[PDB]
């Protein structure tokens, strides 16, 4: 069973957490990313948030009539776009190709969900990266998930963007 | 809104009938949809992930291992399902806070009530083949239920 | 108006009490009369035959093998019983379309609910001793039943 | 007044849960209080001596042996329970006159209904430890029950 690079960054603010992604998406490494979210509402915004930063991001949320769901998907497999934002439902029966990055903007309660999200990345061979961004309300959830899966997710820090409050209790 | 007897009368052997192990605990007398399946045991972290999503036209089918030690669904998690328009829930397990569940516009069938909640470690697997009541469920099957029983087919019906 | 618990107090040994295996499914909560017994299994050809006949003052006691894989009574068959004035039905077996049954002016006591109809072949036997729930039934015995339980005597009571 | 699921959330392990063998037959959906225990079998002489005393804030908990052949609580005796302001009754055994019991402002949890009444001789013990449903019971303890289930604790909750 597969194997992928996995990292996480803890965050203070929603605002921080979304600059973290912004920074992380503007990297040459980033190629075809999908970013998951939890709430319905947050798909629309985070998509805005992204352009402004200067990243064409396309947003796909689970009411969309299936035609739109294809017009969204087609832009991404076309270089036009390399960021898709969605929820777990919004992207259920879709295969997208040659993904390289999966992001958990919101953490899932279960490692089952987690595993399906990062299951998106390729298998082309060349080996994708799953990065979680954890707000302090997600900390437990990051641990519960880690234990679900074989092993924990190693922490990282972006030098410039840096957590100005302490790590949560346990 | 659905009649499982009339359906069996029509489809005959194109449906499979679950053994009479369950009863209604929700506010909707009957219901039906595409199934999504879960295998889990006295834990519901994953059921919160699934029911947080939109499920209009969908039923959550849960292999809870038949446990009546621990409630998988309680009012909180039922209000959350209702809010995301989930047709109904079929739980091979126990349910909880029955008086609150009956006043909700969702279909729930389950085996028994027990007041102790499940854990929330997130342990469980989803979209898996599961078995109970003499029927096998898998994601994409269609389930129809009323106060007479539960039936399931591969393809929609009417 | 039948109180099976009152009756037990009065006639004592002279009544036999059936095991707590059943539940009300029909429109009447209490009911009684002079039975006519039936032995069958996952078939109701015979039931259609007898209920096509008049039954004022009569209960149909059906030994269905205890099956809950196949329903012996659906709405049609019960509508049948009601237009022929039958006091009620006791089915050591399954019933069907419970929602429709609660509405019909007949007593129904059975064991469970399963969406599958019985077969219509007619394989069975009527007017014969049946036995179940710890009690023997012959045609011309008298039966009294309500929400609390079922009792049987050879003579009439009141 | 009582929601047993919330209580389990709050008190976690200070609470023992009874197995889901019971159901409500009385008018009160949920009830709770300090408990007196009684041990007997198919005889309720003790229950009469006991329910004559007053019992506001008290709950009677009966190891009836689990027998469902003879009913420990009929309408007569439930009334005498209401008269003396008793919170509710818990019977590991059978009750009677289900239709009368639901109209009565008390709580009643039991296993089944059977129209034969219990003897009255007086044989039994009270204020002894009793065991059923995987919970063990001493007088002086505290029980809270609703439609979902029954829970027990050493010290009073809230």
Residue numbers in the entry:
A (entry chain D): 219 to 388
B (entry chain A), C (entry chain C), D (entry chain B): 2 to 159
Copy out sentences from the published article reporting this entry, exactly as the authors wrote them:
As an inhibitor of RNase E, RraA has widespread effects on transcript levels in E. coli, although its physiological role in ribonuclease regulation is debated. Surprisingly, in vitro RraA does not inhibit the catalytic activity of RNase E directly, but appears to act indirectly by occluding RNA binding regions in the C-terminal domain of the ribonuclease. We have previously shown that RraA can directly interact with RhlB, and it is possible that RraA plays two distinct roles in modulating the degradosome, by inhibiting both its ribonuclease and helicase activities. We present biochemical and structural data to characterize the interaction between RraA and SrmB, and provide structural data on the interaction of RhlB with RraA and compare the two complexes.
The crystallographic asymmetric unit contains a single torus-shaped trimer of RraA bound to one SrmB RecA-like α/β sandwich domain. Following close inspection of the electron density maps it was clear that the RecA-like domain resolved in the crystal structure corresponds to the CTD of SrmB (residues 219–388). The CTD has a typical DEAD-box protein-fold and engages the outside rim of the RraA trimer, such that only one RraA protomer is engaged with the SrmB CTD. There are no significant structural changes in the RraA protomer that contacts the SrmB CTD compared with the two protomers not bound to SrmB. The last 56 residues of SrmB corresponding to the CTE, which are predicted to be natively unstructured, were also not resolved in the final model, and this may indicate that this region is indeed disordered. Inspection of the interface between SrmB and RraA reveals electrostatic complementarity formed by a positively charged patch on SrmB and a negatively charged cluster on RraA. The interface involves mainly salt bridging interactions of side chains and hydrogen bonds between main chain atoms. Most of the RraA residues involved in the interaction with SrmB are conserved and two of these residues (Asp-50 and Glu-53) were predicted earlier to be involved in RraA interactions with other proteins. Closer inspection of the superimposed helicase structures reveals that bound RraA partially occludes the RNA binding surface of SrmB. Based on these structural overlays, we propose that RraA can influence SrmB activity by sterically inhibiting substrate binding and preventing the enzyme from adopting the closed conformation required for ATP hydrolysis.
